[PDB]
């Protein structure tokens, strides 16, 4: 009874997340296809994505439970096909701002993806269901990265054709969302629900901040003329680590009633220690290994957080809880990015940035490590 919704949802996730053109977005926009200068891309186009994402995260989490999750998944599919038909056939800055608006709509609707399944599956299959859907997305992303790299390098394929392949993938993903079965008809009071949400908000803010400066750190540590290939390979390998880590959460048999905190504390230290390893160490290989541990360790916890939050929800407010925690994550990221990186703030270089990122995650582990009063 739990097989059909899981299968179709995981097919939709895999096909939607498999987009080869993602790693080659900046080269595509500034390349000979559009010629959007670096200043334009970095100042008038990309920032629009954050604000559209933040604004559209409000209706999504306010109205994803009332209208059942399917409607939102279908809207996400339609938004995907327009982000990419406008990236394929869009020229100008205004058109790219509109594409960033539609991509903010796309990414703000992902709450319905992770909230839908618990509304159609029995509670006893919340553990297995949680792992599969998270893993299929990471496996899809790594597959897309590898395919794009091989095609560009070993076959000489222009970025336009990577965009065409991603468009086909997202269209095939949308074609599946029309078959998902339709479900049938202040919750933070619980400590377990609330405290897994506190990690979600703060930890997710730090994660998305690191991802934008890992590669710059590698350039600073080991300046090389072939760093581009090594940069891509490590990113794809790091994601595959998350896929196996998230998949193992829903496969290995363990009692999560008493191991809920222990995993949070134990694996919250690993995320701080790994970041301290990237910044401090001079070896570039150990810096590659630190990134794997950091990404895979985090993807392990986001699977338990979603599984454990949904277990303790008395009401069927899955999109509300998931959508408020991802909204506050953007709030922390946006405010904390201005303080640290933006010239208006501190203007820290990449050399010392990861001591703040590693120290930021150290506090998060500190709060949970200190939850012992005797």
């Amino acid at each position, epitope marked *: 009874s739990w097989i059909y919704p899981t299968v179709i949802l995981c097919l939709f996730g895999f096909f939607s997340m498999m987009r080869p053109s993602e790693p080659f977005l*900046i080269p595509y926009l*500034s*390349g000979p296809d559009k010629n959007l200068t670096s200043a334009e891309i*970095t100042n008038e186009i990309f920032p629009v994505w954050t604000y559209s994402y933040l604004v559209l995260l409000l209706p999504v989490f306010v109205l994803t439970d009332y209208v059942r999750y399917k409607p939102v998944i279908i809207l996400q599919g339609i938004s995907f096909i327009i982000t990419w038909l406008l990236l394929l056939f869009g020229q100008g800055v205004k058109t790219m701002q509109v594409v960033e608006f539609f991509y903010g709509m796309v990414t703000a609707a992902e709450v319905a993806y992770y909230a839908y399944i618990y509304s159609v599956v029995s509670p006893e299959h919340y553990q297995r269901v949680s792992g599969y859907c998270r893993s299929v997305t990471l496996a899809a992303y790594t597959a897309g990265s590898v395919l794009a790299q091989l095609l560009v390098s070993l076959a000489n394929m222009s970025y336009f054709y990577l965009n065409v392949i991603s468009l086909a993938s997202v269209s095939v993903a949308f074609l599946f969302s029309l078959f998902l079965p339709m479900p049938k008809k202040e919750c933070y009071s619980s400590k377990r629900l609330f405290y897994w949400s506190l990690w979600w908000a703060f930890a997710t803010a730090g994660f998305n901040q690191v991802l934008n400066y890992v590669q710059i750190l590698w350039d600073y540590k080991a300046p090389s*003329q072939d760093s581009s290939i090594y940069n891509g390979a490590v990113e794809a390998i790091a994601t595959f680590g998350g896929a196996v880590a998230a998949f193992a959460v829903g496969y290995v048999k363990v009692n999560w009633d008493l191991l809920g905190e222990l995993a949070l504390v134990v694996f919250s230290v690993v995320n701080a220690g790994s970041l301290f390893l990237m910044h401090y160490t001079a070896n570039i290989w150990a810096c590659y290994a630190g990134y794997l541990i950091f990404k895979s360790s985090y993807m392990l916890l986001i699977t338990i957080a979603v599984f454990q939050i949904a277990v303790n929800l008395n009401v069927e407010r899955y999109a509300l809880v998931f959508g408020i925690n991802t909204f506050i994550a953007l709030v922390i990221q946006t405010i904390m990015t201005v303080i640290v990186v933006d010239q208006r703030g501190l203007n820290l*270089p990449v050399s010392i940035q990861f001591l703040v990122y590693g120290s930021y995650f150290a506090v998060i582990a500190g709060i949970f490590l200190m939850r012992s009063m005797y």
Partner: nanobody, 128 residues
Framework: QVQLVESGGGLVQAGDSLRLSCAAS????????MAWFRQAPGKEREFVAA????????DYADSVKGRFTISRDNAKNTIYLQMNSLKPEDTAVYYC?????????????????????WGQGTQVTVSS
């Protein structure tokens, strides 16, 4: 505001050598990719050279390659360009530019749409 002033242009016999300098000020020089452009008398500005912010990559125009070597000095916030075996077609006014975004090379920004904030130019007249 980023200011760039070039220094080194002049009149040199054919086959002599020159070493242009461009002392940048107003930005963290140790993050921005720098480049040299020229504007020959009768054409538009063209790319001549660029050196990544790490200093490990040096892209050159197909014409200059084998005679020009771009150099940078993050200690003095200065960028240089050694011209050797100057041919009569090297006549131009050389401008030094800076990437509009700090880590242009790392993010794979196209080089031909990355440099702005031009300088004031310096006349190089290589005569036969």
């Amino acid at each position: 505001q980023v200011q760039l002033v070039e220094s080194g242009g002049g009149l040199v016999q054919a086959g002599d050598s020159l070493r242009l300098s461009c002392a940048a000020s107003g930005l963290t020089f140790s993050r921005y990719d720098m480049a040299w452009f020229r504007q020959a008398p009768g054409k538009e500005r063209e790319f001549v050279a660029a050196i990544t912010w790490t200093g490990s990559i040096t892209d050159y125009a197909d014409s200059v390659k084998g005679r020009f070597t771009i150099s940078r000095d993050n200690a003095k916030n200065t960028i240089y360009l050694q011209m050797n075996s100057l041919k009569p077609e090297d006549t131009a006014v050389y401008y030094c530019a800076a990437a509009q975004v700090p880590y242009g090379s790392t993010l794979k920004f196209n080089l031909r749409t990355l440099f702005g904030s031009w300088g004031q130019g310096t006349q190089v007249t290589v005569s036969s």
